[PDB]
Structure formats: structure tokens, C-alpha cells
Amino acid sequence: AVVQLTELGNGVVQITMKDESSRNGFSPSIVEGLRHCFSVVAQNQQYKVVILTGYGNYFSSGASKEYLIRKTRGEVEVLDLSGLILDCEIPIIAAMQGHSFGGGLLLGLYADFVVFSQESVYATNFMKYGFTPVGATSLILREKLGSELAQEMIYTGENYRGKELAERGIPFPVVSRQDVLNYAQQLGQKIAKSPRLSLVALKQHLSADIKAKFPEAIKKELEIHQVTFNQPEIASRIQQEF
Amino acid sequence: AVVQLTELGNGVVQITMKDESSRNGFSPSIVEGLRHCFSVVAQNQQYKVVILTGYGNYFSSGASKEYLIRKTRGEVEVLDLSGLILDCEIPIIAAMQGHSFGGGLLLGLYADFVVFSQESVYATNFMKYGFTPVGATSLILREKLGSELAQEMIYTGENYRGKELAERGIPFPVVSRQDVLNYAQQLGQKIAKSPRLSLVALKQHLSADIKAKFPEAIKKELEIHQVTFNQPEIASRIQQEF
Amino acid sequence: AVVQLTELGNGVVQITMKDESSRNGFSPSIVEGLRHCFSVVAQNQQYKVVILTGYGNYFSSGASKEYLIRKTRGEVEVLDLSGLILDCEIPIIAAMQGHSFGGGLLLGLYADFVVFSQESVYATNFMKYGFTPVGATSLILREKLGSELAQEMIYTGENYRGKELAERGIPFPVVSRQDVLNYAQQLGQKIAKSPRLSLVALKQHLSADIKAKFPEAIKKELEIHQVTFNQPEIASRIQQEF
Secondary structure (H helix, E strand, O other): OOEEEEEEEOOEEEEEEOOOOOOOEOOHHHHHHHHHHHHHHHHOOOOOEEEEEOEOOEEEOEOOHHHHHHHHOOOOOOOOOHHHHHOOOOOEEEEEOOEEEOHHHHHHHOOOEEEEEOOOEEEOHHHHOOOOOOOOHHHHHHHHHOHHHHHHHHHHOOOEEHHHHHHOOOOOOEEOHHHHHHHHHHHHHHHOOOOHHHHHHHHHHHHHHHHHHHHHHHHHHHHHHHHHHOOOOHHHHHHOOO | OOEEEEEEEOOEEEEEEOOOOOOOEOOHHHHHHHHHHHHHHHHOOOOOEEEEEOEOOEEEOEOOHHHHHHHHOOOOOOOOOHHHHHOOOOOEEEEEOOEEEOHHHHHHHOOOEEEEEOOOEEEOHHHHOOOOOOOOHHHHHHHHHOHHHHHHHHHHOOOEEHHHHHHOOOOOOEEOHHHHHHHHHHHHHHHOOOOHHHHHHHHHHHHHHHHHHHHHHHHHHHHHHHHHHOOOOHHHHHHOOO | OOEEEEEEEOOEEEEEEOOOOOOOEOOHHHHHHHHHHHHHHHHOOOOOEEEEEOEOOEEEOEOOHHHHHHHHOOOOOOOOOHHHHHOOOOOEEEEEOOEEEOHHHHHHHOOOEEEEEOOOEEEOHHHHOOOOOOOOHHHHHHHHHOHHHHHHHHHHOOOEEHHHHHHOOOOOOEEOHHHHHHHHHHHHHHHOOOOHHHHHHHHHHHHHHHHHHHHHHHHHHHHHHHHHHOOOOHHHHHHOOO
């Protein structure tokens, strides 16, 4: 119920994340709804484009600070949602009409096209808490945003408004929040003019370089994360971010 | 006669494409003239820079729609003009004073330096007709234009004015059509100040990464093109583009 | 004495190059001071960030023309200062408050973060004299500046003001000379908020791709440099640059 799939016509579908209690964080119901909605897409051979979007002021909050505290005590797994986006056969547009944090930003950046909101806040959060990324952050961020913006965003963990990112020349559209989904929907109908077979073939071809590097990047980042996350001072740093 | 080589001084030469009947498309006379002019360059050890340019409102139209229709019926080969640019020992400047479409855009983007016209139209056409690129489009476009502009241009097949491309921050000069060739000629004399041996050595060095990936990229794209081009609905899509 | 290390607080240190006789060129005292100051950093496990900076109107002049003349006669080694920057365990910010030429520009571009001065002049000098780069120039410049700016800067050897580079959209900050060091110092304190272990781990991770390509790039460029540098006309070209 927190993640709904709706048909927009011409094989364009929308996956909408709405879990207001967690602010579209990676809650159990969000992860279940995403896996369900994307498996529905996988069974359907008529769909051509997916637009992934959130609700209100939120695209995706990623892992909560509560989750991170549970993790310092080894009570919870590392979540890897990359497969859902990466193994989807058809192009995905991430319409990030609201804020995206940590794994929430990665969730959008794994997509084939990304639309930012001008007013919203975007962050690879990890180093805000003093530890290194997971989810092949380095690979995807350097590929999509360029190495210098990626490097600064990764080292600092700091928050960037959509408009600040445009001003530093990211290749993605950065429009007003009320325009984000509409824009994605227009781009979606544009792409969906093509035969589905060509869209599937093209996506596989264009993704091959990143796809080939991904398993190793994921494993390497995790090795480093497990070391840096599990240092004594980390729990207290997380606490100071509440 | 449709492709002429002229000496500009200081080892800078110009290859001018003028086939008005086909609009500088890949006509038999254009392909013959290009192969001839570039083999002339290959024999000459005095030349330092080539400026490749078209006529009037056209740099290069690539394969005609008529050619594509002949191709749906297996009457014509896939044209691969990459060798002519890629195997040239000396730097080439593509002065694209007019429109460049499909293989015509690639023809310019294979060059070491590229100059765009503000008013002209630029497209990787393939997906306009519903099928995937040939000629290592993905490789070259992502390398020269960045992955996000490349991806959008490849998925859509749509037409972009020089000025629209500058506004989205491509690293190439985008000047008025009447300025394109002059600009290329000035850059050409600048480069030609260097010893020819250093120019040849530097070009080989800077090209090595792309050169190493190229045969595989070419083969892979062709494999996919042969599948997507030869689907039943394609002939009719081409027909609707006349 | 020409290179001094000073502590700025919170594990941020500054390495200041001041050899006014050579204009911060790669003089014996500059190379000795750099090696000393960086080995001091290597022994200290408390430091988190280094800011590398020059004096007055100069960051680094690289190899003098006098040195190059000695080199045409085989009297001097090729200098490779890359190790000092590349083997430093902690992030380095190159605050290039003044001009940087040839190996002097590379010295800064090897760093994890780079700040340019608006008014200063920046050049990969090699081809100004008619010969090819050393120090993995192609690798680092294409990675940090993008292939098209890198290519033009490498082919021409020409001089670019900080402000000209910003106008062509380099991802680095380009601020007034009086602001360069302050800016670097602020960025330095920002980064130094993180645990040193995470900073060391992250730097290694983010550097791995370039680090893996570097020995081969260095060797390949040197092979080509040794050919192009040692051609008969080169000594006279250097002479005309005095």
C-alpha cells in the first residue's frame, strides 16, 4: 500500500513511494512495496518505461538513524536495493521531487534518467556520520555527476539543494518540485515512442560498462564500510545527528 | 569532385565535402571522395592538421532514408567510415558548419577536435526510426559529450540545435555558421606550430584508450543493431520519416 | 627552509613552497623541502588534511628552461614528483594561489582537491616547446578536467588564466588569489571533521582506479617524451621561450 504501481498509457508506468511515517525511508513496507512493484514490472512484457517517485517533500530518506544504531549493535543487515533498479529490463526515470539521502540518493542515481527538484536537499550521508559509503556510491556518483562533485559530496556527507547542484553543472534536469513528475512523465512518453525490444536492447548495451564493474565495486565498498562503520566513536556520532 | 583537398599553409589542409544532390549524405561519390582525400593525406608526410568540413547548410547527412529502405531488404552493406578518421595519423578538426545526422554526426565526433554551428541541427538519428546505433556511437558520444547528454541523444534520436547543446554544456566550441571554418582554421594553425612527429606521437597516445575499446564496441553495437533494425515495424517507421 | 610545514589545528596542516629565486620551480631546495615535509606527514599519525600552497604570484613553476637545456645535453634526470602527492595517505588540497606550469600544474592536479586563482596563469607547457608531456599528464588531466579541455591544453601548451578555465566549466573552485588559501583552509577543516581512519580508507578507495593505471601511464608517456624531446629542433625551440 505504501508503494503503488499505476499505468500512465503507452507502456509508461509510475511507481510511487508513500510511507509518511518513515518519510520514504527504507522501512520494511517500503522495501516490500518496491520489490513487489518491480517484480510486477518484470512479469509484464507490455511496459516500456518506469517513473519512480516519492511523496510530498520526500523522494527517499534511505536508512533511518534508528536503523544505523541497530546496525552498530549488529541487529540488522546491510540493505542492498541496487538490484531492483539495476535488474529492471526497461528504462527507469527517477523523478526526485523531494529530498534524497544516502541510499535514497543512490536509489535514484542507479536509474537511467534522473530529475532533481530545485528546492529539495540531496546528500550521500555516510561521511556525515563518520563512515564510508555502501552500494557502489563511488562508481555511480563519479559516473553520473563527475568525479569532482562526487568526491566532495562523498568526503563531506553534506546536504545540497537541487539549485546548488545545477549551479555546479550537473548533467541532470533540476526543475521546481511541482514540475518534477510532469517533466519525467513527458520524457517518459518521448522514450516510449520506441519499440520495447529496442529500449530493452539499448538499456542493456548502455549499462554494460557499469554492470561489469558493479559486483566488484559493491563488494569493495562493503569491505571498507564494515571497517569504518564499526569503529568505537561511530555510535556517538550517529547520536549527535538526531 | 564532390570531395576536394586544399592546402592552407603550414601543413594545414582542408577536406571539403560538397555533394549537393544528397546533402552531403553517405552517397557513393562522398564515400569515394573521402577515401581518396584521406589516402592522399596518408601518403603525404608534410601535412600536420586536417580540417574536415561540408558545404552550405550541411556537414554530413549520413545514410539517406532511401538507403535505409534498401537495407531493410538486404540490398546494401552497413557503411563503416570510422577507419578514415580513426586511422588518420594527424589531428583532424571537424568544422561542422552545418547539420550532422546519424553517421554524419559520428563522422565529426571521431575527430580529435570538433566545432559546432549554433544554428545547425545535430542528431544521433537511429532511434528516431526505432532502432539502435552503429559505429560505436555509445563509446564515442559518452567519451566526447558525457554520458547523460549522450544517453538522451541516443535514446530519443531527436534533433538538437548547436545552441541547445552549448546551453547544456558540451565541451566543444559552438559558434555562428559563418565563423565555424575560420575558427577551425585558426585552431589548425595553432596546433601546426608543433613538430609533425610530436603531433603524430601525441595523437596516438591520447587516442589509445578509445582505440583499444573500439573494435569490440563496433562489433557489439552491430550485433544489437542487426537485431533491432530487422524487426517487422521498422520499414514503416522509416517511411513515416520521409 | 624554502618548504615549511605548519599546523593549523584539528589535524589540518599546511605545506608552503617559497623559493623566490626559482619562482617555486623544481629547484634542488624545492624538491628537498617537498620530500622532507611529506615524509614528516608520513610519520605523523595525527594529521588529517594537507594544504599544499606556494608564495606570492606562484604555486609552482615546474622545471626551468635552464633545466630543460641541461636535459637536451643529458646532464639531468627526468624529475618525477608524483609519488610525494600520490603516496600521501591523507587528503591533500592544492591551494594554487598563483601560476602553475608543466610539472607544476601536475603537482597540484595529483591532489585530491584543487583550488585555482582567477587571475593566475595555468599551463601544461610541454608542447609549447614542441615535445610531449611527462608525469601521466594525459591520465590526470583527462580525469580531472575532462578530455576536451585536457586535449586542447596538452596539444597547445598554451597559458590559461584561472577565469578562462572557469568560463569553460572546470569542476574546481576558481576564486580570487587572496581567497585561495582561506577557501582551502575552510574546506580542510570541513574534511577534518571525519575520523582519520575513514579519511585514509576513503582516499585509498577513491584513488584506486587512477592508482591502478598510473605506473603504466607514467612509463608510456616517458617512452614518448624521450622520443619527442630528443629531436634536433627542440633545443632551439626552448631557447626561443626565454
